[PDB]
Every structure is written in structure tokens, then in C-alpha cells.
């Protein structure tokens, strides 16, 4: 099964559908799946029980299924929640953020967050 | 229902249809070239 | 009259009820037929706002629109077991693609002046093959005056050359020795999914044209 | 091949780009808006 | 004659030959249908139209070969 | 920039769509300072 | 008269080569189910009718031209 | 005379192998749209006119060579 | 005569296709081996699906020999 | 008389060549496709780039043709 | 007489393009298995009676190009 | 004459098949050259004059293909 | 004569053909050999042998072909 | 001859065929060398001399065909 | 004078045998500078090998070569 985390909080539910954003893009683990390590990004992460799916802003993390169809997930803070436009507004203050070169990175996450609102 | 609702696509399709009659007519020539033996 | 003639007035008649003989009233549920050409009008016209989507996004929407059309329904009635020629005559496919593309060109020096020709430099190259990159894109651009007209014709063409063929040898085939009597339906089911599937390369073509000839077009109004 | 045994080919196009005609003005005046009708209609139900 | 009723027959096995790119296109299309979904446990139903799409276009091509093919054949 | 540090960064800006509550705030704002040291001597302590 | 008759003989031999292209196009299929299937060992149930369909059209591209083959042979 | 027909037949056969190349190119395309879609699921309406556009231009250079077919049987 | 020179000369453009499979066969066999390198395991399951990629891509130099076959006689 | 089939014949032959350049175009295209995928923001860079991979890839393509034509017509 | 002395010769020339296929076959198999091995170091024992099987299989083709060429070659 | 003329045809005719892997060539560097500046985001300043380099070399087989082909036809 | 002869010459010719494919064989195992080599590193030793196994029969496959022209000539 | 001239002229359509496999081949080089540079960002001090190592041998294999072109033309 | 012709016809066929060596040489290359760049340090063992099958890959489109020149001496 999955071992989905956060710092204060932990939540994660065999493996049989788990849908990642991964450095290969985006994965889909179901029951076995080949042993991997493979970065989260900052993502929108589907855990299915069942076919039920809930989804899940995560703040990226770390994910390594090991062979026995455990997929350890490590991942930060998060969501429906944290999407509900001042994030958006934030984007265009990251905007005058690019006028500092860290500044430039952080700015740039700005802007993939707000990417991240969009695929949600 | 159906209805006759104008639509304004005469200069929009002014070029298409100049090139409807050019065809037409090289066409004509055309076939006239094939009836032939 | 012609045979040809005869059948663009069945195509008339058949597009006429479309629109008055398969919507019962106008019903805002509407009917099982008419999700269809509710869900074809949505595809083609966000298609059009997405690929032209300017202050002009619909206004090529009745011209994109009846080239789906037409060739949507002339190749089903030509596939039928017995029918003639409608886009299996090649002279209506081929000047009517010959004719949007003048009208391409005609509209792109209309609307865009000289400045038509920036479209014949769609890219910021080094300048000594800067000449060069304006010959073969004019000779990329009168391509698809061929191209888009070419592929459809050859398809139906030779799905209807492919089945005829095959039929008059698949008679002769049963009458061989009576072995062939065993086994004597596997050359239709043979002649069965060719006819199937020369429906389907045929609608896969009204909407390849209806995106191609709003490509050519985009590249046109929008230069580069 | 069966269709350049015509000659026919200006009369077959004749008939063709006439059918065009007939067919472009058809959709844009009368069958499209009468699509564009229930689309509107729909929106204006879902307003009230 | 004989001359021109052996080229009917060998212009129209040279024709043949045209189909062999599209049989080998219908498989990469397929090819590529099942690493993605293997990716995604479900990319698939959007995939599945795109597969039939490259398929059916690579197929299209293949048949322009194969009517030349029966023209010179039978004819 | 670095991973973590990336990753960091997203969840600082996660406490941004809109909408939040205090735990986020406070696990994204404590930031202090960290006395730079040296091989005795000690540079100054510049922010965490 | 020995022009036609070596035709037929020619011509059914030149339409074979064709056929080759088909073969490779299905075990191209074959390879991406197997690829497929280990990097997600429960995606093959889906997986195993896409292949098939994939072999099945493949094949098909094939027989078509060795169709040609039998009929330059036998006419 | 029976040469010029016979080579006339002949020629059309010929130019028809160049065709299936560009069959290949389409399926190509196709194939390359379905990998980038399962790698980002969210790329797929930037992807899809640079698609469109390379079938097109893959497909074109073999349309030249089929016009060449008919020219060398109807001319 | 003729028609002799033209049996041995189709018999002989036939066994060209037979290249075809020789790569064929390969190609489900380099999938094998990299599939169960990659899991340690899937073999079982893999071999009947391997074995039926690989008689496929055979069979289609077989074919192409069976013209042969057909034009080397008559 | 033969030099009339002599043309069509070569032509038949030069026509062939367009194949290599249908292939080639579509390699660019898919490896536009796959760096975007990759990417997903390299297109600005790569998208005149991938116009010019193009063009090169007819260009080779069309000078196949135009010895077809340099036969028939001349 | 001529002929037919020449066709053999011409007809043995012909079967031998068909072994260069298998001869990128065998190739192909043994890429697998280097790579396979070099990525799990000890595959090696599973792999090895299925990788010979392959190879095999692959050569075959190759083998049967070559009689063809005797058949022809000798008449 | 007739002979001697067809001779340099049929040569100019074959001549044009090995242009075909030049041309290969070039969308292969450019496919490259795609694929680096993808992966990189920043290799290009380099990677581009680089490019061209290898579009000319590749290309160069091609131009010396189609120098015997003017020198058939022409010379 | 000249017929029989004539076609001794151009069978061989086109027998060439069948060597290009052992070349581009030899090819593929080394490029394997590689990019195995670069993903182990240190799987060499094992698996050089394997390199060299898959060139030999490769080329073996050229070897024949050239066997075939000699006897035509 | 007229026979034997008409070889000169066929022949040297043939041997220009030849070169194609060197035209891909340099391509594929530059093709690494673009990957390899984007790989490391600077593996390219000693790995440009290989690419014109790579390049050269390639290119060599071309020119015999080439050479043979000019030779028969010529005669 | 059919035989000095022949000869010359079947040193031009005998090109077509040369081009699978000429890919072939560019692979392994392709692959030594896949491999370094992947690894740094791995190139100066690696050589000698890289070097081995480079030759070796050419030598069979030599071998079609010298059948070239066999028929063209006869």
C-alpha cells in the first residue's frame, strides 16, 4: 500500500491505484509495480481506494515503491482547499519577485504553483 | 426554426468564390479537351 | 440529366433532413440523433475558436464546417453495395481543393497586402539562406493545394476499386472444387471488413480536412 | 480506372460547385443559427 | 503483346510493395498505445482514439499502393 | 536551486490558490537566523 | 507466350517481399507488451486484447499484398 | 510501340514504392503525441497542432510521388 | 528457354521477405530479456505471450519461403 | 521509342527518393513532440529549429523529384 | 540453355539478399541480454537458456535464405 | 543512340535513390539537436553552430550523390 | 558463353548485399557493449565475452555471403 | 561498345546507391555528440575529437561507393 | 562484349554492400559517446574497445568492396 506523509501528519492509502506527478512525468502504481525511487514533484496527487479517488495537493516529496508493493511516499505539506486567487495575485507579485535572481527559482516555483491551481 | 438569419460572408468569401468561377471556366476547356478522341 | 447530378441532389435532400426531419420541434432535451449534431457542432466550433479564435474565430466556421460536411456524407452513400460516384469522382475533390486554396491566397494578399509574402519567411534564419527559406515555403504553401485534395480522393477510390475486385473473384472462388464450398464464407467475411473499413478512412477525412483547412488558414491570416 | 472513361467531368463539376453554393448559404443562414437557438435558449434557462 | 501482358503483371506486384510502410506504421502506433498506458495505469481512454487515429492515416497511405496495385493486376 | 530548497519553497508558496490555517502558518513562518562559525571565529549570525 | 507465363512466375515473387514488413510490425507489438507489462506487472489484462488487435491489423497489411502474390501465380 | 505501353504500365508500378515512407512518417507522429500525453497528461493542446502539421508534411513528399504514378499511366 | 530461366529467378525474389522475420524474431526476444531484467520475475507470465511474438515474426519468413517454395518448382 | 521509356522507367526510379525525406520530417517532428513532452517549455527555443529540420529533410526529397521531371519533361 | 545457366547464377545472387535480416537479428537478441545483465548484474542464470532460444530462432531465418540460394545456385 | 541515351536515364534514375540517406541525415541532427536543448534547457549556444556543422556533413554524401546525377543527365 | 558469364558476374554483385547486414550486426552488439559497459560499469569482464559473441556470429552471417560470391566467381 | 558503354553509364547509377548508408551514418554520430554534450554539459574536449573520428570512417565507406561511381561514368 | 559489360554492372551492384558498414561505424561511435558522457572517467579502458569494434564493423563492407575490384580484374 502507499505511505503517504506530511510533517506534523501522515496520510496515505494496496497500491493497486496511486497516480503521481514524478520526474517520469506522471505514474501510475497499481499493486506491484517495478521497485523505483522517483522524485514528486510539487503535484497533484490522485490516491485511489478502489477506483474511489481522492485528490491531493502536495508540495512535492520523494516516492520509492519497494518491491513488496509498498509505496513509500514521503511528502511534505499540502488540496481543494489551498486552491479555492490570491495565490494567482501572489503569481504576479512573484512576477516583480523575477527582478531578484534564489528570488528568480522561488518565483519560477510561483509560477509552476499557479500552473499547479490550473491543472486543478 | 430554420430561418433566414443574414450572414455577412460576401467580401469574407470574396476570394473563394472568384476562384470557383476561374475554375469553371478552365474546366469547361478542360473537358472539351478530353471528349475528344 | 447525369447519374452525378442525381446523386447531389440526394446529398442535398439527405442534409435538409438533418436539420428538419430528425429534430422533433426545436425540444430543448432534443433527440437520441440530435446529441450528435449538437456534440459535431461543439467539436468543430471550439476547434475554430481555438484555431482561429480571433475576431474571425466563427466567422470560417460555415466554410470549415461544409467541408466536413460534404464529405462526410459522400462517402457513406457511396459505399453502398451499389452507387456510382460522388467523391469517387475525383474532378469535384480536387478543384474544390484547388479552390479553397486560391481563396487562401487571394484572401491572404487581400487582407495582409505584400505582407502576404512575410508569411513565405516564417522564421528568422541567417540571412544568406534567407531567399532560400522563402522558396520552399512557397513551395510548401502551394502544396497544400494538392495535398488536402489528393488524400481524399485516393481513399475512397480505392476502398470502392479494392471490393468490387474482390467480389467478382470471391464468385469464382466457390465455384472451384467443392473444398472450397468448406470454408466458403471466409472469403466474405473477407469483403466484409474491407467495406467497414472503407467507411471509416472516409469520416476520419471530412474532419482531417476541416483541420487541415484550418491549419493552412492559420498559418495565412496569422503571417509566419 | 472506372471514372476517366467520362468526359462528362465539366458537367459532374458543374453540378458539384452548385451543390456547394446551395449547401454554404443553407448551413450559415438557416441550420446553423438554428443550433445556435437551442444553445442560446439553454443558456437563457439556466440564467432563470 | 506478350511484351505489355508481362508488364501488367509485374507493374502490379512492384505496386505491391508500397503497402509493406503502412503494415509497420499500424504497429508503432500500437506500440506506443500500450507503453503509455503501462505509464499511467490509465492514460487509455483518451489514447485509445489517438491509436486508431495514427493507424488508420498510416493505412491510408498503404492503400493508395495496393489500388495501383489492382489496376495493373486485374487491368 | 536546490531540491529541498525547492520543494520548501513550493509549500511556502502552498500557503498561499487561497484560503490556509495556522499550523501552514506557523510551519512556514518561524524563520530565525543561524550563526555563521568558522575554524573559534564567527561570522555573523545571517538569517536561517 | 513465354512472356506471360514468366510473368506470373516473376510477378508472385517480387509481391512476397512485401510481406516481410507485416512480420516485423507485429513483433514490434509484442515487444511493447512485454516492456509494458513488466514495468507494471497489472496492466496486462487490459493490455493483452490492444496487442492482439495491434498483431491482427498488422498481419492484415501483409496479407493483403500476399493476396497479390497468389493471384500474379495463379493469374 | 508495345515497349512504350509496357514501359508506361511498368513506370507507374515503380514510383509507387516511394509512398511508403511517408505512411511511416504519419504513424510516427501519432505515436510521439501519445508518448508526450502519458508523460504529461496536460501537454496535449499545445502538442496537437505541431501533430497535425507533421503528418501533413510527412505525408506530402509521397502525394508528389503518387501524382508522378498517375502522370506516367493517364499521360 | 525462357519460361526454366524465370521458375529459378522467382523462386529467388521470394526469398528476399525472409529478412523480414530474422529481425522480427529478435525484437520479441530483446523485449523478453530487458522485460524480466527489469522485474526479476514477470517470466512466467511473459513466456507463452513471448513465444506466440516469436512465431508470428517466423512465420512470416515462412510464408515468403513457401513462394519460394512454389516458384523454385513451377 | 526506347529513349520514350527510358524516361518513364528512370522516372519511376528518381520518384522512389521523396520516401527517405517522408521518414525524415517525421523524425523532427517526433523529436519536437518528445523535447516539448520533456520539457514542457522548450518550444520557443526549439520551434523555428524544428521548421528548418523540416525543410532540410524535403528539400533532400524534392531534388528526387525534380530528377523525375528533369527526365520527362526534358 | 544460356539463360537458364544464367538464372541460376542470377537466382543464387537473389535468396542471398534475404540472410542479412537475420543477421541484424541475432544482433539484437545479444544487445538485450548485455544490457539486461549490466543493469541487474545476475539475470544472467534465468536469461540464458531463453536468450540461446531467441538467437536461435533469429539464425534460422538466415539459414533458410542460404539453401534457397543452393537451390537456385545449382538448379 | 537510343541505347546509349536510355543508358544515361536509366543510370540518372538509380543515381537518385542515395540522396534518400543524406537527407535522413539532416532531420536526425536536428532531432538531436531538439532533443539536447530539451533535456538541457541551455546547451544550444554551443549546440546550435554544433547543429549546423553536422546538418553540412551528413548533407555533404547527399550533394555528392547529386553530382553524379547532373553529370548522367547533363555532362 | 557470354550470357552465362554475364550472369556470374552480376549474381555475385548482388550477394554483396547479404554482408552489409553482418556490419550493421557487428554494430549493434558493441553498441550494447556500451551502453551496458556505462550503465554497470564494472559489469566488463562478464560481459565482454558476450560482446564478442554476438559480433562473431553477426559477421558469420557476412562470412557465408562472401563464401557464395567466391563460388559464382 | 555500344553494349558495353550502356554498362558504363547503368553501373554508375547503381554504385551511387552505395553511399546512403554513410549519410545516416554521419548523422547518427552527431546526433550522440548533441545527447552526450546535453548529457554532461561538457563532455565535449575529448568527445569532439571522437565525432570527427566517428564522422571520418563513416564517410570513408561513402566515398569508396563514390569512387566506384566515377569509375564506371567515366569508365 | 556482353561479359565487359557485365563486369561493369556488377561493381556498380556491389556499392549496395558497402552503406550497412557505414551506418555501423557511426553506431559504435555514437554509443562510445553515449556511454562517456554518461560516465566521465569510463573512456581511456573503454578505448581500446570502442576502437575493436569500430574496425570491425568496417571490415565487412570492405569485404564487399574486394569483391568489387574481384570482378573488376575478373
Given at each position: 500500500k502507499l505511505q503517504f506523509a506530511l510533517p506534523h501528519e501522515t496520510l496515505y492509502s494496496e497500491v493497486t491505484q496511486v497516480n503521481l506527478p514524478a520526474k517520469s512525468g506522471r505514474i501510475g502504481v497499481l499493486?506491484?509495480?517495478?521497485?523505483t525511487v522517483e522524485q514528486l514533484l510539487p503535484g497533484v496527487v490522485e490516491v485511489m481506494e478502489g477506483s474511489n479517488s481522492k485528490k491531493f495537493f502536495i508540495s512535492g516529496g520523494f516516492a520509492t515503491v519497494?518491491?513488496?508493493?509498498?509505496?513509500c511516499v514521503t511528502a511534505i505539506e499540502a488540496p481543494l482547499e489551498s486552491f479555492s486567487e490570491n495565490i494567482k495575485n501572489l503569481l504576479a507579485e512573484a512576477k516583480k519577485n523575477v527582478s531578484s535572481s534564489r528570488e528568480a527559482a522561488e518565483a519560477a516555483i510561483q509560477v509552476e504553483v499557479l500552473e499547479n491551481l490550473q491543472s486543478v | 426554426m430554420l430561418k433566414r438569419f443574414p450572414t455577412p460572408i460576401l467580401k469574407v468569401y470574396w476570394p473563394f468564390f472568384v476562384a470557383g468561377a476561374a475554375v469553371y471556366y478552365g474546366m469547361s476547356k478542360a473537358a472539351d479537351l478530353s471528349s475528344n478522341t | 440529366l447525369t447519374t452525378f447530378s442525381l446523386y447531389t441532389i440526394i446529398v442535398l435532400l439527405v442534409i435538409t433532413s438533418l436539420y428538419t426531419?430528425?429534430?422533433?420541434?426545436?425540444?430543448?432535451?432534443?433527440?437520441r440523433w440530435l446529441i450528435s449534431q449538437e456534440a459535431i457542432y461543439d467539436t468543430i466550433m471550439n476547434m475554430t475558436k481555438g484555431?482561429?479564435?480571433?475576431?474571425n474565430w466563427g466567422l470560417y466556421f460555415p466554410m470549415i464546417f461544409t467541408l466536413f460536411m460534404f464529405i462526410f456524407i459522400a462517402n457513406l452513400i457511396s459505399m453502398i453495395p451499389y452507387s456510382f460516384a460522388?467523391?469517387?469522382?475525383?474532378v469535384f475533390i480536387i478543384s474544390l481543393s484547388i479552390v479553397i486554396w486560391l481563396g487562401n491566397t487571394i484572401l491572404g494578399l487581400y487582407k495582409?497586402?505584400?505582407?502576404?509574402?512575410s508569411l513565405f519567411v516564417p522564421a528568422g534564419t541567417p540571412l544568406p539562406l534567407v531567399p532560400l527559406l522563402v522558396i520552399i515555403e512557397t513551395l510548401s504553401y502551394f502544396a497544400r493545394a494538392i495535398s488536402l485534395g489528393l488524400r481524399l480522393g485516393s481513399n475512397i477510390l480505392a476502398g470502392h476499386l479494392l471490393m468490387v475486385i474482390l467480389a467478382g473473384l470471391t464468385f469464382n472462388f466457390?465455384?472451384?472444387?467443392?473444398f472450397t464450398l468448406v470454408f466458403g464464407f471466409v472469403p466474405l467475411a473477407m469483403i466484409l471488413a474491407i467495406m467497414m473499413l472503407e467507411f471509416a478512412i472516409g469520416i476520419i477525412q471530412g474532419y482531417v480536412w476541416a483541420i487541415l483547412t484550418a491549419s493552412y488558414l492559420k498559418d495565412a491570416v496569422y503571417l509566419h | 480506372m472506372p471514372q476517366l472513361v467520362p468526359f462528362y467531368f465539366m458537367n459532374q463539376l458543374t453540378y458539384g460547385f452548385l451543390l456547394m453554393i446551395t449547401l454554404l448559404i443553407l448551413f450559415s443562414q438557416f441550420f446553423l443559427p438554428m443550433i445556435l437557438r437551442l444553445y442560446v435558449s439553454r443558456l437563457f434557462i439556466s440564467k432563470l | 503483346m506478350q511484351l505489355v501482358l508481362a508488364a501488367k503483371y509485374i507493374g502490379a506486384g512492384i505496386s505491391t510493395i508500397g503497402l509493406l510502410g503502412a503494415g509497420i506504421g499500424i504497429a508503432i502506433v500500437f506500440a506506443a498505445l500500450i507503453n503509455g498506458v503501462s505509464r499511467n495505469?490509465?492514460?487509455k481512454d483518451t489514447v485509445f482514439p489517438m491509436a486508431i487515429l495514427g493507424f488508420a492515416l498510416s493505412e491510408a497511405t498503404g492503400l493508395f499502393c495496393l489500388m495501383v496495385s489492382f489496376l495493373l493486376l486485374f487491368g | 536551486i536546490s531540491y529541498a530548497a525547492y520543494l520548501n519553497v513550493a509549500a511556502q508558496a502552498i500557503r498561499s490558490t487561497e484560503l490556509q490555517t495556522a499550523s501552514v502558518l506557523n510551519r512556514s513562518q518561524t524563520d530565525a537566523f543561524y550563526?555563521?562559525?568558522?575554524?573559534?571565529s564567527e561570522p555573523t549570525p545571517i538569517t536561517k
Open positions: 499493486a506491484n509495480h517495478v521497485p519497494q518491491p513488496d508493493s509498498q509505496l | - | 426531419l430528425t429534430n422533433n420541434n426545436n425540444k430543448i432535451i432534443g433527440s484555431q482561429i479564435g480571433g475576431k460522388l467523391s469517387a469522382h475525383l495582409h497586402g505584400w505582407v502576404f509574402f466457390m465455384l472451384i472444387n467443392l | - | 495505469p490509465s492514460i | 550563526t555563521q562559525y568558522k575554524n573559534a
